[PDB]
Each structure stands twice: as C-alpha cells, then as structure tokens.
From Swiss-Prot, chain A:
It comes from the Eukaryota. This is 26S proteasome non-ATPase regulatory subunit 8. One of its GO terms (biological process) is proteasome-mediated ubiquitin-dependent protein catabolic process. The lineage of its organism: Eukaryota, Metazoa, Chordata, Craniata, Vertebrata. Keywords: Isopeptide bond, Phosphoprotein, Proteasome, Ubl conjugation.
UniProtKB/Swiss-Prot annotation, chain B:
Belongs to the peptidase M67A family. GO terms for molecular function: protein homodimerization activity. Component of the 26S proteasome, a multiprotein complex involved in the ATP-dependent degradation of ubiquitinated proteins. This complex plays a key role in the maintenance of protein homeostasis by removing misfolded or damaged proteins, which could impair cellular functions, and by removing proteins whose functions are no longer required. Therefore, the proteasome participates in numerous cellular processes, including cell cycle progression, apoptosis, or DNA damage repair. The gene is PSMD7. The modification N6-acetyllysine is found at K9, K19. The chain holds residues 196 to 260 of 324 of the full protein. It comes from Homo sapiens. Component of the 19S proteasome regulatory particle complex. The 26S proteasome consists of a 20S core particle (CP) and two 19S regulatory subunits (RP). The regulatory particle is made of a lid composed of 9 subunits including PSMD7, a base containing 6 ATPases and few additional components. Within the complex, PSMD7 interacts with subunit PSMD4 through their respective MPN domain. Interacts with TRIM5. This is 26S proteasome non-ATPase regulatory subunit 7.
Curated annotation (Swiss-Prot), chain C:
This is 26S proteasome non-ATPase regulatory subunit 3. Transmembrane segments: none annotated. Component of the 19S proteasome regulatory particle complex. The 26S proteasome consists of a 20S core particle (CP) and two 19S regulatory subunits (RP). The regulatory particle is made of a lid composed of 9 subunits including PSMD3, a base containing 6 ATPases and few additional components. Interacts with UBQLN1 (via ubiquitin-like domain). Interacts with ERCC6. Residues 1-108 form the PCI domain. Belongs to the proteasome subunit S3 family. The gene is PSMD3. It comes from Homo sapiens. It comes from the Eukaryota. Component of the 26S proteasome, a multiprotein complex involved in the ATP-dependent degradation of ubiquitinated proteins. This complex plays a key role in the maintenance of protein homeostasis by removing misfolded or damaged proteins, which could impair cellular functions, and by removing proteins whose functions are no longer required. Therefore, the proteasome participates in numerous cellular processes, including cell cycle progression, apoptosis, or DNA damage repair. The modification Phosphoserine is found at S61, S73. The chain holds residues 358 to 497 of 534 of the full protein.
Length: 257, 65, 140
C-alpha cells in the first residue's frame, strides 16, 4: 500500500525490477475495489487520482522501454479513465501530452480514420493553445496537400520529449509511400533523384535500399525494374456467367404462377 | 436435347477413331481427311469477334431492359 | 450566406479571403457541428484546380502546371500529382523524363461490356418492383 511513488522515475529509469513492482502495484490497486460503477464518493475518487497517476507513470515507462503492444494497452485504460461517467475529477496536468502521445502514435501506424474520430473530444484545445495536440494536427495537415518536406524539416521542433519512437516509424511509413510512388515501372533514375525524391545526399540509406531492394548504383544510374502487369484479357470469357445472368431473368418472370 | 445429341454424335465419332487408331480394324482413308477439315473450320475468339459481340449483345439487351 | 460565400472562395485560389470567411462565420460553423472542415477542406484547396486542369487539359507540362496552380516551385508538382493519382483524383500518368502528365486512353464505353452492367442493375430492380407489387396487391 502506497508503493514506490517516485522510486526510479524522476531521476532515471533503466530498471525492469520496479516495472515488476508497478505490476505488483497494479495488483494492489485493482484488488482495492473496482472502477466500474463510480456513483459518487469522492473518497473512492481518491484512489482514482492515484490509479490514473500510476498509469501515467506506466505510460511514460512504456514509451521509454520501446514496447508497442503495451503502450496502447496502458493508454486505452488511461482513456478509459477519462471515460469516467461521473467526472468531478480535478485536472491532472499530464493529460494533453498523454493524448498527444497517442495521437501521434495512431498517426504513425496509418490509422487515419481513427485519427480524426479521436479529435472530437477537444472543444478548443486544438486551436487556442496546447502545442502538444497542435503538433500532430498541424503535422496531419502537412500530409494532406503536397507538403512532404515540411514534415521532415519540422521534425526538429518538439515541445515535449523528442517523440523519437513515434517519428522514426512515422517517417519510415512516409518513405515507403515515396518508394511505392517510385517503385513503378518508370525504369531508371540517378543518385540525385534519390536525394530529391527518396532523400539524403550520400547516406547509409543508399546502402539500405541496395541490400533491401535493388536500386543499385551502376554507372551513375539506378535500375528500377518494370513493375508493369501483363493484362491477359479476352473479356468474352464472361460467357458462362453472362449466360447464367440471362437465366434468372426468365426464371423470375415465370415460376410464380 | 439439341445439345444432348451433340456429344452423342461426338461419342460415336469418339469411339471410331479410338478403335481405328488404337489398331483394330483397317483404316478408311476417305473418312480421315473428311474429318480433318472439320477441325480446321471451327471459329476462334479474336478482337473482331470481341468488339462485335458486345456491340450486338448490348443491342439485344436494350430491348429487354 | 456562409456556404455559398464559402465555395465562392473554394473555387478561387484565394486563401486570405478563405481565412477571412473563417473569422467571419466560425461561430455558425461551430454551431452547425462542423468544426472539422478547416483541417479537411484545406486539402481540396489544391485538389480542386488539379482536378480542374486534368479535366481540361490532356497532356500538360509539369513545369507549366506550377504557375497555373501558383505552386511557386516546379519540383513538388510531381508530388501533388503523385498524391492525386495514388489517391485516385485523376486516372492520368506522369512521364518522369521531360515533364509530361498525359491523360487516359480513348473513350470506349460502349463496346467493352460496361453497358451490360448498368442494364443488369435496372433489370434487377424493375422486375423486383413487379414481384413485390403482385404479392402486395391482392390481399382478398
């Protein structure tokens, strides 16, 4: 009870032992009573201050330890605790960047339909203030029109911690779209098109795509193979299904007598 | 039953060039090349068959629809 | 008065007027339950004209389309047209060799089985009215 509030978080967190103790702290809290009814009772809202705070510190530990399924696991239950039905609940000041962690994460795995339907819950924090939520929606605005490069240039400006586990997957799922645009049957380009389209004057990334894909620098020339289909068509070969399609016409005219 | 006799005539001409080509009875020569031009007379599918068929299947279809 | 003057600015390439509409009529937009337009309609501010050009022209130079879409750079004109075709705004294509954005094939929408598809939809609905009518008509 009242177990290790700021033991190995405020200074440094390289440990997994207190992560097992936070697991034991999860065993203590979710065996206190419950969180399901929440009828009144500010006294049982007292541990609701505690339970949200210890999952905030579990969320900070989850992104620090580079863990994908568990980060959304704790964040959902955090969102379930802002799904409180009887919400007196004085404002825990970590909420807005906590949503911005999820809002940037769920942009990164291309849940764009889930991106915009999450944005409904904020009345005026999107526009008036709150750079933590303003950063992904300005980012998602930059993905809209034509603006790839402003994403890669405004990477180096974060109000919070560096968001590194989000943005590198986020840029990597932009690189394959540029790749999937340039992996077409348009045959050959040069290394300067790699700098313009792909990115990066002479990187290790040109060695990356040399070993992952082809695109090998020959006599100052990249070779992308033809991704062109063959199109074997007769299109009278819908002859059985077309002869079938005529039959249920005359069937449905008749047969009800 | 117009088509049930199509293979019925064909199952007879099936069995003839089974039992004459297998090696039982002496071959006629007249019936062989008189069968040969049949196989070099069936139509095939082409682009001229293609665009024409949907030109007039649609035209038959419009009256129904 | 808001929405007609809204699409008045959308069809034009103007934005300082468009933000003037937002400051003028944001209260009604917030009252109508449509906060979300400002994040999603600024997308189609550039996508309206590039659909308009690809409907008008047939084989455009991407150098020329930058001034016509006032894009102020010929090099990202590959990227917007790449976003248009990957998302399927126009069925055109780019020659990444000398600036071509060439359009589709010749119109062949009568001798390529497509009139049969619409004709099957109208069979399957019209005689479906017939069978539903005959059952519904005779109760006694």
């Amino acid at each position: 009870m009242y177990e290790q509030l700021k033991g190995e978080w405020n200074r440094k967190s390289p440990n997994l032992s207190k992560c097992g103790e936070e697991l034991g702290r999860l065993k203590l809290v979710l065996l206190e009573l419950n969180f399901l009814p929440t009828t009144g009772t500010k006294l049982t809202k007292q541990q609701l201050i505690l339970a949200r705070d210890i999952l905030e510190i579990g969320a900070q530990w989850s992104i620090l330890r580079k863990d994908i399924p568990s980060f959304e696991r704790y964040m959902a239950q955090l969102k379930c605790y802002y799904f409180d039905y009887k919400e007196q609940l004085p404002e825990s000041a970590y909420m807005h960047q906590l949503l911005g962690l999820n809002l940037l994460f769920l942009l990164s795995q291309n849940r764009v339909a889930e991106f915009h339907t999450e944005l409904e819950r904020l009345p005026a924090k999107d526009i008036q203030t709150n750079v933590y939520i303003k950063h992904p929606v300005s980012l998602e605005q930059y993905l809209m029109e034509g603006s790839y490069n402003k994403v890669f240039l405004a990477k180096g400006n974060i109000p919070a911690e560096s968001y590194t586990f989000f943005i590198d997957i986020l840029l990597d799922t932009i690189r394959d779209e540029i790749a999937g645009c340039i992996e077409k049957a348009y045959e050959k380009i040069l290394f300067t098109e790699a700098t313009r389209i792909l990115f990066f004057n002479t990187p290790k990334k040109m060695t990356d795509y040399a070993k992952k894909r082809g695109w090998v620098l020959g006599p100052n020339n990249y070779y992308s193979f033809a991704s062109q289909q063959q199109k074997p068509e007769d299109t009278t070969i819908p002859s059985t299904e077309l002869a079938k399609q005529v039959i249920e016409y005359a069937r449905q005219l008749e047969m009800i007598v | 039953h117009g088509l049930k006799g199509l293979n019925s005539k064909l199952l007879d001409i099936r069995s003839y060039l089974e039992k004459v080509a297998t090696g039982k009875l002496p071959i006629n020569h007249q019936i062989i090349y008189q069968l040969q031009d049949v196989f070099n007379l069936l139509p095939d599918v082409s682009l001229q068959e293609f665009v024409k068929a949907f030109y007039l299947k649609t035209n038959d279809q419009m009256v129904v629809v | 008065m808001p929405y007609f003057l809204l699409t008045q600015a959308v069809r034009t390439g103007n934005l300082a007027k468009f933000n003037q509409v937002l400051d003028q009529f944001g209260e009604k937009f917030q009252a109508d339950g449509t906060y979300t337009l400002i994040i999603r309609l600024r997308h189609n501010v550039i996508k309206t004209g590039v659909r308009m050009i690809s409907l008008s022209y047939s084989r455009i130079s991407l150098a020329d389309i930058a001034q016509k879409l006032q894009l102020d750079s010929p090099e990202d004109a590959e990227f917007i047209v790449a976003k248009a075709i990957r998302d399927g705004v126009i069925e055109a294509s780019i020659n990444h060799e000398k600036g071509y954005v060439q359009s589709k094939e010749m119109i062949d929408i009568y001798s390529t089985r497509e009139p049969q598809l619409a004709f099957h939809q109208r069979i399957s609905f019209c005689l479906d009215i017939h069978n539903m009518s005959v059952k519904a008509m005779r109760f006694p």
